[PDB]
Amino acid sequence: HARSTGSYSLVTQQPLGGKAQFGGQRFGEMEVWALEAYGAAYTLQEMLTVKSDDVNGRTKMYKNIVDGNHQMEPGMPESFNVLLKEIRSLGINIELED
Amino acid sequence: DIVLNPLGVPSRMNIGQILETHLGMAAKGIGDKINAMLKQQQEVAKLREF
Amino acid sequence: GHIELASPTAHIWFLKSLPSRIGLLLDMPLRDIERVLYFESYVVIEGGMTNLERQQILTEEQYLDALEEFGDEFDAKMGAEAIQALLKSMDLEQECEQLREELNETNSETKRKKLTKRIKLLEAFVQSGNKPEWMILTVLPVLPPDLRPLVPLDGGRFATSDLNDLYRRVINRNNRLKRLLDLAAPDIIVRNEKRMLQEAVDALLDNGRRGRAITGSNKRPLKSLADMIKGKQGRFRQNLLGKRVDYSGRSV
Amino acid sequence: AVVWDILDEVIREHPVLLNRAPTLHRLGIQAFEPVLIEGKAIQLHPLVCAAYNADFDGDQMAVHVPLTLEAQLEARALMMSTNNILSPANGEPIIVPSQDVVLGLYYMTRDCVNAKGEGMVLTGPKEAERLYRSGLASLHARVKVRITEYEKDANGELVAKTSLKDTTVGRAILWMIVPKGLPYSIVNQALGKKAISKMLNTCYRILGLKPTVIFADQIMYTGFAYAARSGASVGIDDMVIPEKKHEIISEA
Amino acid sequence: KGEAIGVIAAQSIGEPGTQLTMSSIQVKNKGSIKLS
Amino acid sequence: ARVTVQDAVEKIGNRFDLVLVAARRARQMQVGGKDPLVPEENDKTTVIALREIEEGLINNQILDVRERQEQQEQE
Amino acid sequence: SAAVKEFFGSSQLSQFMDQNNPLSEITHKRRISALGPGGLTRERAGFEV
Amino acid sequence: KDLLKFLKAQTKTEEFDAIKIALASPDMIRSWSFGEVKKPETINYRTFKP
Amino acid sequence: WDTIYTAGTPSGTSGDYIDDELPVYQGETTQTLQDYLMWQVELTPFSDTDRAIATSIVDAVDETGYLTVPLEDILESIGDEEIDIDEVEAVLKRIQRFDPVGVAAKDLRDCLLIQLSQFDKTTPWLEEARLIISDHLDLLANHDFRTLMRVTRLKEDVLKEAVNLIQSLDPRPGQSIQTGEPEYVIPDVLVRKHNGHWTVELNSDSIPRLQINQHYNLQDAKWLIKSLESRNDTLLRVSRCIVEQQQAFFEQGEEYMKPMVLADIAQAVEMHESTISRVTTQKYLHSPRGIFELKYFFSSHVNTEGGGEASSTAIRALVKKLIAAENPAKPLSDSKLTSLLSEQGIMVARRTVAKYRESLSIPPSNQRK
Amino acid sequence: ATESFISAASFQETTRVLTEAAVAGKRDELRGLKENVIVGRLIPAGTGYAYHQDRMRRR
Amino acid sequence: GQNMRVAFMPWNGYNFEDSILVSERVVQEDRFTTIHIQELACVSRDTKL
DNA sequence: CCTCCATTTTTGTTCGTTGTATTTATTGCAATTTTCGTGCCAATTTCTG
DNA sequence: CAGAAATTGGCACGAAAATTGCAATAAATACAACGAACAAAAATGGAGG
Ligand SMILES: [Mg+2]
């Protein structure tokens, strides 16, 4: 099984799972630990943002790759915004600043 | 037909496969003798004796 | 969005998460506060000039006797409004100074630790901009709809999810309580409605932590907001620390 | 038909990341240069399996593509399999031969008391190889070979010395892949797994990283070739039972 | 500088975890005897 | 540079600074339109940068000097 | 009829037959399970069972 | 307005340095909201719209 | 006994549902026509203004792939006063060549010309078809072939080849991107003939599992239990009354439906008119004739000279039957229709007949020959 | 018992950590690896190390 | 299964760590060829329109 | 006989890795909007001179 | 090709009919199976003065 781009989840905006759904491979905590141990910061930032759930970054990365310019402009993952909304639904004021 | 690594036998201790290989060789040899007799048509007495 | 609650309701996280912050701040044991919140016993908010003092936990018969003896010379309440009144009137700097004096006067080990912890809680509350009465809910936030979608079925029909069920129960209880209160019903009914509203809000915020988990059609507990937040299937461990990615494959 | 030429053009020097689960240490992910093949299975270098804890009886691997230039350079400089020959837990090599390679290297570096071609005098390793390939000398025959070896100087330069060594045909044959700077006593014995690991570690400590990769690949090739040539098998007569077993059991 | 050594140490300790399970003095060799 | 990066690491000293320097030079050659200082032999820019660093023709100081010179020339 | 249909079609111990070969079917039909309704659970079972 | 700036505003990413957590006043909760929910009814099945 | 099915589609699931905890529903994303169009817009070397114009243009494309607002609307929606209309036209021309070709066209002639502009010049009957589409596209709609032949100055065979080439194109290019899946409806009440008379019965696809959680609260749900029973009772009674009053619609099809209203059923079932209007909406019944909404059986009426009333649906069916068998050489005008229905006792007007014909989507008499 | 409540709520006991942090009005400075992994930034180690110092000089 | 003629020996690293080396004559004779069958369904329904 | 310390009891939090779903409850008024048939006239096309 | 009939439909008219918000609405026997470590807090016993 292989995948370059496909359909995403509606709430988390992340790739789905399974071969029958043309899903992606999971990059769990232990793979993150391995990348941290190597010291590959840019590979990890690619895994976390422009390949899973940074939407504008997803589109701009695809356009840049087709354009012949291998460079990313990362943003904020959608799941963190979902987390902020879910925490604020508990009556707790959590926010970014400065 | 097939080549298998001999290094997988001694550490796993499944010695049944080696004995099965030997006995299968013996059975195929019996079959080969019968086939050789059948091809050069010989009398039924020799076939049933063997 | 938001929901306007007809009556104040305590936040279960700040009450039933050990050590209890409400109890530690009011220096009252947890069980007494739980009894008062769930409409079982009375607490005296103002001692007035009678024998009643602060935080004394009356009962129903004791309250009736107090009413017939001392009359209208005191103030005693039950429910979340009583705890809100206790928290609102209480001061912080003076309590800090008195606790410091008591700590530096008497000599012990257990009570010294208790007073140190209470002093730390009070100082933390003063340093932050928070006010203690914010630990009682009066307005309730409502999650955006696209983060709690309905479940489509065959034939072009939808089924409600768990968060929607909990929100519906809260809204129904709130509407019934508002109608009863405007209709001037007897107290023995409005108090029951208030208790059921408190239970519904507690179930919505953290289902199963207090009492028993409310189940659905599948005889299984519903998913509250805390369930979304925490666990091995929560956002942190399932989405924010690891995730599925594009440009990947697998094979033998 | 042209998209395959395009595909060969784009993957030319673009690394990929291979990962096998569970990832227990950082050597569970490694970077490789792809070679396009037919079929549906991923081919893996034999020397890295120990790092992955992988074997070819049904395992699967995931493959990821780095996109930007920084990621590609990190794959080439930090994660590539040629940068990961030493363990990070201890200082020992991890990319080391095993099984068939070890069996072949052990078999070729052995001596037999009365073997064909024993007692000859050879002008060097090439004559030993020429004799072996012609059938004129056994791989285990004890001979005398003129060996030239180099040693590093105080200022860091190699000086040569040549002498007649008592060895066997197979050890002189194996000496042709050992890089300059290592002593001949490193192969003048029957090699096992520990001896080969020691030889790789000595090569790394004396000569650096670049010769060590070449040495490891040559060792793998030679071990495979001679393990194939030996014809080593397993039979039922190989498990020899001692004759004293019956008496010992009876006495017990 | 910048190496993440805590993760390396934790992985080094944790990786081999699955291999683990779940009236008199007689001198042995020649040498002087020391007391402290 | 095609197999090992040992010479480049020795030239730059740190394996973490080498990635940054090589990425900067490769981005110059891939998008900025600069020409390689070594004979290109059907190599990618990521490998051309490392081969330039091996020969000692490129490091951070040289890149900064060339950037200042180019900016002053364009001014 | 609803109860009988539910038991035969959606119980824990009612399963699609294993049908790779005759041996799979024979093995499936002679199988004993400690799980199911009125039995143990995969996690809170024990170690001596 | 201008459509170019309108479209460019919706891809802008916030820049921050720290995360701050605290209790929420009733005024803060009201300031988050865009309206109040009064009915427990989700979808009108007789017209298929909220 | 309820009929047991003699055939069926074996269920898709082939698992043992062993896991006792499964996550919450989230859903997936879908690629519609506009998603594909925007994906193509991003990967095109536009400019900032060009990309804004393209965004505004793609916003206006409908399901069939046709532009739904004039270019002046788009130019106004841009919101910048330096931009003229020719830039919008150029961006629209560039967009119209995206896959599928012909999308975002102003009208049919434009789409057909766009599709013909892509064929190589060596296609045999290209100029003739181009001329037909460009100049005379309504003479083809009238199936004339003689005045068109008198204007195009061509023989028969060339015209036939050109028409065949024209009709091989795609009039709705944007329907290729199929993001939708055919959705269906589940009948709630089934009508079957028992003892020669039609009787109704509720569908058994619902959930009748009456259960309570006595392990531990359920008092509120006890009221919902009987609320469901009330819903079932009212639905069954209303449907039964409808079927009892309409015993002749099922037997002989249309042309026999009675002119009933909400008040009749309200009087029959002893409920308010509003309740009848609520129950008989978006609820369906299945009959050997098809699936019909309960609202389908309520209709208007017209005076009958014999002293009765005739439903409007019956008159629509009679109009359909009469028009279907008109004279092919010279069709029937509505003046003729009002005369034919007059002799039968149906006293309707002429404009009413025209309205009925319009509702049935039937071309006038001159267009039916 | 670390200075970051994000890095502590990610690990265990989310309810207790979040309650204490909300009561105390804590502020998180995003200095560890886990915090930057959560928000999808560059970790302050390896090739990202030289990046973070730059920001720490402009703050 | 099938009866295969087998030898136990190392062959140039192609049976390294539980790998199997197979002759081309095995493939030519279709000794391990299998048949797989699949079912699909189209349902013509009735709807409102 | 009181405080206070130690001890047993009570409650809470954690534990290797995928699976495919069934929700809506009504009911009686007063107001509002929607729709009905049918007339009027104006533009169309159609046949005849 | 010109001169009006025959046709069709947009627009409008009163009048019947379909569609909405908004307060009022009840409670009847069964329901399940078995986990282990470990820590922090609470309830009680008991002893020094
Ligand atoms: Mg394996």
Side-chain angles (χ1 to χ4, degrees), chain A, chain B, chain C, chain D, chain E, chain F, chain G, chain H, chain I residues 1-206 208 213-216 218-369, chain J, chain K:
Chain A
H1 180 47
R3 168 201 176 105
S4 60
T5 295
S7 65
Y8 305 90
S9 182
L10 260 182
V11 179
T12 55
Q13 293 288 344
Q14 294 179 359
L16 294 174
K19 175 180 179 178
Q21 304 181 258
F22 209 81
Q25 300 300 316
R26 183 141 213 279
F27 205 80
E29 304 193 41
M30 289 138 68
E31 287 83 33
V32 175
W33 300 343
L35 283 189
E36 293 168 356
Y38 273 121
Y42 284 87
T43 313
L44 192 52
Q45 193 180 27
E46 284 183 21
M47 290 287 188
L48 300 174
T49 60
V50 300
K51 293 207 267 182
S52 194
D53 50 357
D54 181 14
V55 191
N56 304 318
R58 259 148 45 182
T59 297
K60 285 184 287 192
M61 183 85 252
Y62 198 101
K63 175 184 179 62
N64 274 15
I65 291 179
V66 174
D67 196 18
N69 177 26
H70 304 155
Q71 188 177 22
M72 61 171 171
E73 293 104 39
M76 171 74 74
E78 204 65 36
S79 297
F80 187 68
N81 298 318
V82 177
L83 180 80
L84 291 180
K85 286 300 185 301
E86 287 173 344
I87 293 191
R88 293 195 191 194
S89 294
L90 289 154
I92 292 178
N93 181 28
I94 181 175
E95 56 195 11
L96 317 176
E97 70 186 27
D98 205 320
Chain B
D1 291 329
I2 288 175
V3 188
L4 298 177
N5 208 21
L7 290 182
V9 187
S11 173
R12 273 70 173 266
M13 296 169 297
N14 46 12
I15 309 304
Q17 54 173 337
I18 308 296
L19 295 171
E20 164 164 353
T21 297
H22 293 332
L23 191 52
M25 184 200 203
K28 192 75 174 192
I30 293 297
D32 284 349
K33 301 272 274 194
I34 291 182
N35 175 45
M37 275 201 303
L38 270 170
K39 256 172 165 51
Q40 43 170 2
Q41 312 94 25
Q42 287 185 347
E43 315 308 323
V44 188
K46 278 169 281 188
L47 261 173
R48 62 201 317 168
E49 197 271 353
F50 179 81
Chain C
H2 77 262
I3 299 175
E4 283 282 352
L5 297 183
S7 177
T9 298
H11 199 288
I12 188 184
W13 270 21
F14 300 94
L15 175 77
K16 257 248 182 175
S17 181
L18 312 178
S20 190
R21 322 307 278 163
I22 292 180
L24 189 62
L25 200 54
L26 296 180
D27 213 322
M28 226 191 304
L30 181 69
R31 301 175 302 100
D32 293 358
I33 298 186
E34 292 193 32
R35 284 193 304 164
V36 177
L37 283 182
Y38 289 91
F39 296 85
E40 181 178 0
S41 307
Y42 289 78
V43 69
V44 177
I45 305 181
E46 262 294 340
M49 289 306 304
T50 72
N51 194 271
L52 303 174
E53 73 285 352
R54 191 69 70 92
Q55 297 183 9
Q56 178 174 353
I57 310 301
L58 272 56
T59 72
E60 31 173 336
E61 44 273 356
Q62 294 181 18
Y63 178 59
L64 303 180
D65 283 58
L67 275 186
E68 75 179 10
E69 296 152 354
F70 304 104
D72 212 336
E73 302 281 324
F74 63 90
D75 309 80
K77 289 184 181 294
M78 65 155 48
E81 191 178 14
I83 305 298
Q84 183 178 20
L86 283 177
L87 289 158
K88 193 186 312 169
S89 58
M90 182 182 55
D91 195 354
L92 293 172
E93 288 80 9
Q94 276 60 24
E95 284 286 348
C96 288
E97 297 304 321
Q98 293 302 330
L99 282 178
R100 263 165 174 165
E101 295 186 19
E102 178 181 345
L103 190 56
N104 100 274
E105 282 167 353
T106 60
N107 303 317
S108 174
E109 167 65 24
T110 66
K111 292 178 180 177
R112 193 181 68 89
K113 297 183 71 65
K114 187 194 303 179
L115 273 19
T116 300
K117 184 52 190 173
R118 206 180 188 276
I119 282 265
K120 196 58 59 58
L121 175 66
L122 265 72
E123 294 291 341
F125 242 108
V126 176
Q127 281 194 2
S128 61
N130 310 334
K131 291 185 291 186
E133 52 273 10
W134 291 348
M135 299 199 291
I136 312 289
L137 293 177
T138 317
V139 192
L140 198 67
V142 178
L143 188 75
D146 273 9
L147 304 183
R148 44 173 175 87
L150 293 169
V151 202
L153 299 170
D154 48 326
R157 48 188 180 180
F158 299 91
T160 51
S161 56
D162 303 338
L163 292 191
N164 304 121
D165 301 327
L166 304 166
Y167 278 133
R168 285 196 326 105
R169 215 170 317 273
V170 173
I171 296 173
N172 279 334
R173 284 304 179 185
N174 197 26
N175 279 340
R176 293 173 187 170
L177 172 60
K178 191 180 306 176
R179 171 165 49 89
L180 254 57
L181 192 61
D182 165 59
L183 188 133
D187 298 324
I188 203 181
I189 306 302
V190 305
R191 290 218 291 257
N192 221 263
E193 281 290 342
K194 288 180 178 182
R195 177 182 54 87
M196 278 178 289
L197 174 61
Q198 171 89 42
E199 295 199 2
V201 175
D202 288 5
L204 165 67
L205 295 182
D206 199 337
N207 190 19
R209 158 170 300 282
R210 206 277 186 271
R212 44 161 294 267
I214 157 182
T215 59
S217 58
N218 331 328
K219 67 175 184 180
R220 54 181 35 180
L222 300 176
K223 289 278 167 290
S224 53
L225 300 158
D227 301 329
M228 309 276 90
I229 294 303
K230 73 192 176 57
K232 194 193 282 78
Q233 306 288 309
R235 297 304 173 194
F236 281 112
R237 294 184 62 176
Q238 193 76 355
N239 294 118
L240 291 182
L241 291 167
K243 52 190 73 186
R244 299 186 175 271
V245 291
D246 294 320
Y247 307 92
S248 51
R250 84 179 303 106
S251 180
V252 174
Chain D
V2 70
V3 312
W4 299 112
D5 295 356
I6 297 296
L7 180 60
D8 277 85
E9 273 295 80
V10 307
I11 69 111
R12 180 178 154 77
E13 289 178 323
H14 195 137
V16 296
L17 306 176
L18 292 181
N19 167 243
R20 181 194 172 272
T23 304
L24 296 184
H25 51 2
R26 82 182 193 186
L27 300 146
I29 308 180
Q30 268 167 97
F32 300 90
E33 282 183 345
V35 186
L36 293 182
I37 61 173
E38 295 74 14
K40 299 191 173 185
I42 303 176
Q43 290 182 349
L44 195 70
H45 195 265
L47 284 191
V48 304
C49 299
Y52 278 106
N53 193 36
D55 57 356
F56 314 98
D57 66 351
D59 302 27
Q60 300 184 63
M61 273 203 187
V63 37
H64 302 266
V65 182
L67 301 178
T68 62
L69 294 178
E70 289 87 358
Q72 297 172 41
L73 280 155
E74 287 175 359
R76 186 162 294 266
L78 303 177
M79 314 179 53
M80 187 145 287
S81 60
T82 54
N83 317 125
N84 305 329
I85 57 177
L86 294 178
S87 183
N90 43 42
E92 327 295 332
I94 42 176
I95 309 290
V96 285
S98 63
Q99 297 200 9
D100 313 17
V101 189
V102 164
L103 187 67
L105 279 214
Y106 170 88
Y107 180 83
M108 67 184 305
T109 61
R110 279 207 54 180
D111 49 332
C112 196
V113 172
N114 195 70
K116 182 179 184 179
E118 178 178 6
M120 308 179 71
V121 187
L122 312 180
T123 63
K126 290 185 301 194
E127 184 171 353
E129 184 189 35
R130 185 160 62 250
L131 287 187
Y132 170 69
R133 280 276 143 78
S134 299
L136 297 173
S138 180
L139 206 53
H140 307 125
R142 302 183 294 191
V143 298
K144 208 142 55 181
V145 186
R146 168 186 282 175
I147 294 296
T148 296
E149 49 180 335
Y150 302 80
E151 194 158 17
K152 241 168 173 55
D153 200 10
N155 48 22
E157 183 49 40
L158 304 184
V159 291
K161 59 184 304 299
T162 299
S163 50
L164 266 169
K165 309 269 194 177
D166 294 279
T167 169
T168 73
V169 169
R171 297 165 187 173
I173 291 179
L174 180 66
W175 174 251
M176 278 190 291
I177 65 165
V178 176
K180 299 180 182 296
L182 273 62
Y184 186 77
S185 65
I186 237 175
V187 298
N188 215 35
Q189 57 192 345
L191 295 183
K193 195 173 184 179
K194 288 176 175 54
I196 296 168
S197 291
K198 226 80 63 179
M199 184 168 55
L200 277 181
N201 202 321
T202 291
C203 182
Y204 188 80
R205 286 330 194 283
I206 300 184
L207 299 182
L209 173 81
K210 209 250 185 177
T212 307
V213 177
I214 308 175
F215 195 21
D217 267 333
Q218 291 293 279
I219 287 179
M220 187 182 75
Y221 300 152
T222 302
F224 278 153
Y226 284 84
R229 256 182 167 264
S230 64
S233 213
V234 49
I236 199 54
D237 292 359
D238 294 356
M239 317 167 193
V240 184
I241 303 175
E243 185 52 42
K244 299 182 182 179
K245 180 196 175 90
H246 183 264
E247 293 83 326
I248 298 167
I249 291 181
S250 301
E251 295 175 355
Chain E
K1 294 212 304 174
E3 305 246 14
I5 53 171
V7 178
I8 298 176
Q11 281 174 333
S12 305
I13 299 178
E15 190 247 340
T18 65
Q19 306 181 28
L20 311 181
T21 60
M22 178 178 176
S23 167
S24 295
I25 299 177
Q26 316 168 7
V27 144
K28 291 189 57 179
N29 290 284
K30 184 185 182 184
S32 60
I33 292 294
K34 170 68 74 62
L35 285 77
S36 297
Chain F
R2 308 167 176 89
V3 184
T4 61
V5 294
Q6 199 63 26
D7 319 63
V9 169
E10 166 192 358
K11 244 65 172 59
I12 304 297
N14 198 11
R15 238 177 184 94
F16 296 137
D17 301 2
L18 171 65
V19 173
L20 307 181
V21 175
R24 183 176 176 181
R25 176 55 183 168
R27 193 169 318 282
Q28 281 182 2
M29 273 182 298
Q30 188 192 42
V31 175
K34 310 299 169 56
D35 272 3
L37 307 179
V38 292
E40 173 196 348
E41 306 175 30
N42 216 30
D43 286 333
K44 261 61 176 60
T45 40
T46 53
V47 180
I48 297 181
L50 293 173
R51 295 201 301 110
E52 294 179 17
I53 295 180
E54 283 185 2
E55 302 281 59
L57 302 170
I58 290 290
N59 57 83
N60 209 26
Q61 224 276 334
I62 290 176
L63 294 178
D64 295 319
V65 160
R66 287 169 176 257
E67 228 62 59
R68 273 192 306 270
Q69 172 178 314
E70 201 162 21
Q71 180 71 295
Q72 292 174 355
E73 182 190 39
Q74 300 304 323
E75 290 184 5
Chain G
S1 189
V4 179
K5 155 175 176 172
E6 202 285 332
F7 163 66
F8 274 104
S10 72
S11 177
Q12 291 198 29
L13 298 177
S14 182
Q15 295 154 357
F16 280 81
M17 187 174 70
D18 197 6
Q19 213 170 1
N20 276 288
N21 44 91
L23 185 59
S24 292
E25 314 171 7
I26 286 300
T27 303
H28 200 174
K29 295 168 188 174
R30 293 172 59 90
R31 178 177 302 172
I32 319 291
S33 185
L35 311 169
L40 307 182
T41 49
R42 202 180 334 279
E43 303 296 331
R44 303 156 58 252
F47 214 150
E48 312 297 339
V49 74
Chain H
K1 277 184 55 182
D2 196 60
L3 190 61
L4 279 74
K5 302 185 180 65
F6 176 89
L7 294 185
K8 199 168 68 178
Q10 300 175 339
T11 60
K12 175 173 51 58
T13 325
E14 186 170 1
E15 179 60 33
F16 65 101
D17 306 327
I19 295 184
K20 161 75 161 49
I21 187 175
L23 274 165
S25 168
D27 296 54
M28 194 65 186
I29 298 179
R30 286 194 180 95
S31 184
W32 294 339
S33 57
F34 284 80
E36 189 199 12
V37 181
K38 306 184 184 66
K39 310 183 101 302
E41 309 166 13
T42 56
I43 289 295
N44 192 285
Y45 278 98
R46 287 142 66 259
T47 178
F48 294 115
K49 67 209 313 175
Chain I
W1 79 295
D2 293 323
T3 61
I4 189 62
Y5 304 144
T6 52
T9 303
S11 199
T13 62
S14 53
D16 197 57
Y17 27 91
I18 182 62
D19 229 8
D20 200 78
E21 277 288 346
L22 74 190
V24 288
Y25 170 82
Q26 297 190 4
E28 319 180 355
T29 62
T30 59
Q31 218 213 24
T32 60
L33 173 63
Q34 295 189 1
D35 291 329
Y36 189 53
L37 286 180
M38 287 306 301
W39 176 84
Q40 298 192 74
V41 167
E42 304 306 325
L43 297 183
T44 299
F46 275 145
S47 57
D48 297 324
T49 291
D50 288 354
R51 212 167 302 272
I53 296 178
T55 303
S56 193
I57 287 178
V58 176
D59 186 23
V61 174
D62 78 320
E63 303 296 334
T64 47
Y66 280 80
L67 207 59
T68 63
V69 294
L71 294 192
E72 304 162 350
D73 285 45
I74 297 172
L75 180 57
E76 169 183 345
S77 67
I78 295 300
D80 191 2
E81 287 68 22
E82 159 76 316
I83 304 173
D84 295 84
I85 193 76
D86 54 349
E87 289 183 338
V88 180
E89 254 290 344
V91 177
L92 181 69
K93 282 213 193 67
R94 184 53 178 99
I95 289 190
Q96 280 169 352
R97 274 66 178 179
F98 288 174
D99 184 60
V101 181
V103 73
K106 298 177 183 176
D107 48 3
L108 169 64
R109 171 195 178 276
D110 194 3
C111 174
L112 300 177
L113 285 187
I114 292 162
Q115 295 188 44
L116 284 194
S117 74
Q118 296 290 287
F119 293 155
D120 40 356
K121 57 193 300 180
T122 61
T123 304
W125 291 278
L126 188 60
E127 348 286 342
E128 307 84 339
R130 196 185 307 264
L131 191 272
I132 295 180
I133 300 181
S134 182
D135 274 356
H136 327 95
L137 194 56
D138 217 323
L139 303 190
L140 182 66
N142 283 16
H143 314 81
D144 177 276
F145 278 66
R146 55 176 299 105
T147 69
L148 178 64
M149 188 140 57
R150 191 183 64 253
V151 182
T152 196
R153 320 310 303 265
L154 289 178
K155 279 68 55 190
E156 283 280 50
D157 178 56
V158 45
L159 184 55
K160 304 312 172 62
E161 300 297 323
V163 164
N164 276 264
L165 181 56
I166 288 176
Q167 292 182 338
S168 67
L169 299 177
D170 201 5
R172 303 166 174 88
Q175 284 189 353
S176 305
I177 292 86
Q178 175 195 330
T179 173
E181 223 276 350
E183 300 177 5
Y184 299 93
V185 74
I186 293 178
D188 327 313
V189 38
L190 318 176
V191 179
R192 285 177 173 84
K193 178 164 59 181
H194 173 279
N195 192 21
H197 69 275
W198 303 85
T199 34
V200 346
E201 49 182 6
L202 278 189
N203 196 334
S204 52
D205 82 313
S206 60
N213 41 85
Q214 301 288 352
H215 191 6
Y216 307 104
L218 32 67
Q219 304 132 328
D220 309 316
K222 295 303 178 177
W223 177 247
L224 179 71
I225 288 182
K226 52 193 65 61
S227 301
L228 310 190
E229 304 166 344
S230 170
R231 140 95 306 187
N232 291 274
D233 156 62
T234 179
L235 170 64
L236 184 57
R237 284 205 307 166
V238 176
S239 44
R240 189 181 310 277
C241 182
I242 283 294
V243 171
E244 283 180 337
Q245 189 49 253
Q246 296 287 344
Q247 204 85 180
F249 163 77
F250 302 92
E251 213 74 19
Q252 311 172 33
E254 291 172 355
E255 315 171 24
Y256 297 94
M257 186 151 59
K258 299 306 177 299
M260 74 205 315
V261 288
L262 296 179
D264 305 1
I265 310 301
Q267 285 293 334
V269 313
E270 310 298 331
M271 278 177 173
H272 194 265
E273 170 195 8
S274 181
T275 299
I276 300 301
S277 169
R278 279 181 166 83
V279 177
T280 71
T281 302
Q282 294 294 335
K283 302 195 70 65
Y284 296 81
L285 78 88
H286 174 259
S287 172
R289 319 196 64 88
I291 291 183
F292 307 106
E293 190 180 13
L294 300 186
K295 194 171 303 306
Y296 176 80
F297 300 97
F298 300 96
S299 57
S300 59
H301 85 93
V302 198
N303 307 323
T304 302
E305 191 174 9
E309 301 190 4
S311 172
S312 69
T313 313
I315 301 173
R316 287 187 173 97
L318 295 193
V319 167
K320 156 76 65 56
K321 178 168 57 61
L322 290 183
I323 294 184
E326 63 186 0
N327 176 259
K330 194 179 183 64
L332 276 38
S333 51
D334 307 2
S335 176
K336 316 296 174 55
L337 289 172
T338 315
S339 303
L340 268 62
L341 294 175
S342 172
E343 73 193 28
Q344 202 169 344
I346 314 296
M347 306 308 300
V348 301
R350 209 285 317 184
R351 182 56 170 82
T352 308
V353 175
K355 169 188 180 64
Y356 287 166
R357 184 196 114 277
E358 163 259 21
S359 70
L360 268 301
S361 72
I362 290 185
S365 65
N366 66 285
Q367 307 180 14
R368 297 193 295 264
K369 61 184 186 302
Chain J
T2 49
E3 294 178 328
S4 185
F5 69 94
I6 293 293
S7 177
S10 308
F11 172 50
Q12 274 187 9
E13 314 189 26
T14 305
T15 300
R16 195 192 70 177
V17 174
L18 285 187
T19 306
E20 251 83 76
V23 163
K26 276 165 154 287
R27 189 179 190 263
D28 200 329
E29 298 284 350
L30 310 177
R31 304 184 190 273
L33 274 58
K34 203 185 308 301
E35 300 85 286
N36 293 274
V37 164
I38 293 291
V39 292
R41 290 185 173 182
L42 286 177
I43 54 173
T47 51
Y49 180 67
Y51 169 81
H52 273 255
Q53 289 179 130
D54 277 355
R55 295 179 72 262
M56 293 181 60
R57 298 176 313 183
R58 301 304 170 258
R59 278 159 51 174
Chain K
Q2 300 283 337
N3 290 119
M4 294 287 123
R5 183 181 170 99
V6 72
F8 281 97
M9 61 173 306
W11 203 88
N12 294 126
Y14 275 106
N15 38 25
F16 176 81
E17 282 278 5
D18 293 325
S19 310
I20 301 181
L21 182 73
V22 181
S23 184
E24 194 186 16
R25 179 161 291 167
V26 179
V27 182
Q28 292 180 7
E29 297 163 344
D30 283 323
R31 305 208 62 178
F32 289 106
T33 298
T34 58
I35 300 180
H36 302 266
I37 310 182
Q38 189 174 355
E39 189 194 272
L40 311 96
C42 182
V43 180
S44 164
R45 273 186 177 86
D46 197 325
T47 184
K48 50 184 66 181
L49 299 169

